[PDB]
């Protein structure tokens with residue numbers, strides 16, 4: 569089997585991407601944030617505290633004839649940005665772009681933190697990291713990808729995120745028309761439950777490539793590119809007037825600037841992030857100071873190749889017995 573679904577930016581900045589997911593019988597379609605940095609499929613639901621729902625589409629398991637309460641099971645997750653959610657668990661039928669899994673754990677939120685409430689466009693998350701990170705207790709549950717894997721034509725999924733435009737998540741096959749040149753594969757460590765790999769270095773604009781190992785995670789659920797302070801300093805030094813602002817909480821730059829590209833290494837290959845991808849717009853409405861799309865990972869504890877980086881590439885998440893990651897230009 570295979571599946572293919574379009575993923576759409578939630579706003580004009582590409583803060584995140586939503587992909588439609590069918591849950592239950594008859595289908596209830598929710599727009600979920602596919603997140604390769606976590607491993608829970610959770611949704612706003614009829615069980616979510618009413619004051620914490622503001623415009624989201626909810627899953628109502630009582631209206632699904634295939635829903636079954638997973639007895640005694642609960643979940644609770646906290647994300648890098650300090651947001652959180654928690655609740656109970658059902659199993660139900662879940663389909664993405666024509667690919668169907670029966671008995672998928674669907675984690676129904678009883679509580680969500682303010683940032684989720686305040687974002688009416690995201691109805692939940694679909695985790696695509698490794699199932700070892702799944703928070704369901706007392707019996708850990710598998711991700712949608714892990715459940716589908718054996719049925720897929722090939723044990724892979726691909727992320728092709730757009731810049732200010734729709735893109736595609738494919739399951740079970742590699743669309744060879746979706747990228748240029750070849751896919752370069754690189755080793756993955758699953759020891760922390762993430763798609764963790766090591767970039768071979770970077771360049772800023774037309775500058776020379778610096779060969780240096782940068783360990784980090786391929787994370788579709790993080791907006792920005794988080795890298796070591798030395799690297800980030802080298803980037804923003806090429807932008808007149810750019811500076812790290814303590815009050816804003818990162819590097820900002822004059823909105824009148826033309827940003828340089830940023831290149832990252834994948835083995836001997838090179839992925840080029842155009843400068844425009846690094847512009848995240850005014851820090852506040854009407855401001856002429858703009859927020860940067862490359863920020864320091866210092867104090868996160870890990871480097872994160874988020875959407876800013878991933879959207880510059882066609883990315884293969886290879887779930888073979890020994891997982892690997894593939895990158896191609898596009």
Ligand SMILES: CCc1cccc2cc(CNC3CC3)c(=O)[nH]c12
Pocket residue numbers: 583791792815816817818848849850851852859
């Ligand atoms: C993509 C992220 C993003 C985009 C656009 C603007 C901002 C602004 C801030 C800083 N505001 C905090 C200090 C009160 C931020 O942290 N992330 C932004």
